[PDB]
A paper describes a structure:
M1.HpyAVI encoded by ORF hp0050 is an N6-adenine methyltransferase belonging to the β-class MTase. It has been reported recently that this enzyme recognizes the sequence of 5′-GAGG-3′, 5′-GGAG-3′ or 5′-GAAG-3′ and methylates adenines in these sequences.
The cofactor-free and AdoMet-bound proteins were crystallized at different conditions. The catalytic motif DPPY lies in a loop connecting αD and β4, and the cofactor AdoMet binds in a neighboring cavity. A hydrogen bond between D29 in the catalytic motif DPPY and the amino group of bound AdoMet is preserved as other MTase structures. Residues D8 and A9 from hydrogen-bonds with N6 and N1 of the purine ring, respectively, and E216 also locates at hydrogen bonding distance with O2′ and O3′ of the ribose. In addition, H168, T200 and S198 contact the terminal carboxyl of AdoMet. The phenyl ring of F195 forms a perpendicular π-stacking interaction with the purine ring of AdoMet, which stabilizes the orientation of AdoMet bound in the pocket of M1.HpyAVI.
Author numbering:
A (entry chain B): 1 to 31, 59 to 156, 165 to 229
B (entry chain A): 1 to 32, 59 to 168, 173 to 231
Amino acid sequence: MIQIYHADAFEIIKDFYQQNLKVDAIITDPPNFKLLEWIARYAPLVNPNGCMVIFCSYRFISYIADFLEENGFVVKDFIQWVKNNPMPRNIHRRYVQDTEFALWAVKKKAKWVFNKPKNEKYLRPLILKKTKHPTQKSLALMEKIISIHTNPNDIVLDPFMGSGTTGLACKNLERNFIGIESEKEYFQTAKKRL
Amino acid sequence: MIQIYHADAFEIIKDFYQQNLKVDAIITDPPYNFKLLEWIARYAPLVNPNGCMVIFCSYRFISYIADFLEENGFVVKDFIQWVKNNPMPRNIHRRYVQDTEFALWAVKKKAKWVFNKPKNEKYLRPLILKSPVVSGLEKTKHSLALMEKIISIHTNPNDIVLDPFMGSGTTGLACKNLERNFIGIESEKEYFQTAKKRLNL
Ligand SMILES: C[S@@+](CC[C@H](N)C(=O)[O-])C[C@H]1O[C@@H](n2cnc3c(N)ncnc32)[C@H](O)[C@@H]1O
Ligand SMILES: C[S@@+](CC[C@H](N)C(=O)[O-])C[C@H]1O[C@@H](n2cnc3c(N)ncnc32)[C@H](O)[C@@H]1O
């Protein structure tokens, strides 16, 4: 199944509460700032064996990890993605920025999903190199995230979906996506890409 | 130059205060209520106008360290990171292997900092090394080529590098081979003396 809503994630959670909605994994790329709050409100929706994968900057990453663990989750690890072709800035005075961070947490007593192909170890999921969106996470990245932390059909929820691409990864992997967007141009971008 | 002290860093910082000690770069690997973020507040005054800090941390502490650093008059430029060629591995089938070590790079606020990129172009992952063997000693917080690359980048040959928690002295030894003028402190004597034997008494 694929459902996209054009809504504010913070008010639409009340509808999901009454409906007793329960999703397997929350895989999202979030944008006086909380941003820790949505986590508190979307945490109840996760099934006992479920997990979260949350994109974040390293400036916020420790906060989110600690916050997650106050909400009944255990932060298992970090995942990260590197582009092969950074547009270089201040090459001589500073490190180029090729890296994107995400946090992987699971529910506290959960028996979670991992899925390693016959192969060994892990932890930099991808080597990777479309939309008009300002910040879009790529498809191949999202597809790998999903192949790992979810199973052939699980219910994946992305409260901030942007251009989608969390869904598109789910659709291609047959992963049952639900997603939300507040603004109309992004919602429709996500909609016809699906 | 190489000088090592055996002391509690929080106890020796007062001595450094009145001794008017000034160090160019604090490159350290701290240990992990508290608030072992405070040493940062206390060791900040010792850093020269153009100086910098490099602080090893878990991704669980990295955001805290970053914000505190920037409250003490430093600007966080970036993070640096190291990957082992040889993870053990542990808990493979159920989990990610642990191959990574994180550190934070900040500079004093209006500083003209060092960096030093070789004519060779980019990253952000100073080194993927093999993890220590016959340089490997007796301590679990223990790597050298990493410290040498960290130093080759964020310091210049005659600068003064301070490691308030020096552990086995892997920062001192790196400084020595790169001719970098090391100062270091250690609380434990088995660690202090090993470092002392690594830097040639
Ligand atoms: C940082 S972007 C991530 C984009 C997405 N990961 C992609 O691949 O394109 C987060 C998105 O969440 C949307 N958003 C912001 N506030 C929201 C809210 N209150 N409720 C639902 N969506 C929101 C924004 O429109 C933004 O495009
Ligand atoms: C993470 S280890 C650093 C090890 C070192 N980087 C190495 O490669 O060998 C931190 C060290 O700081 C020491 N330590 C703990 N408290 C200290 C203090 N108050 N002052 C100085 N050193 C301390 C510990 O004994 C430990 O050896």
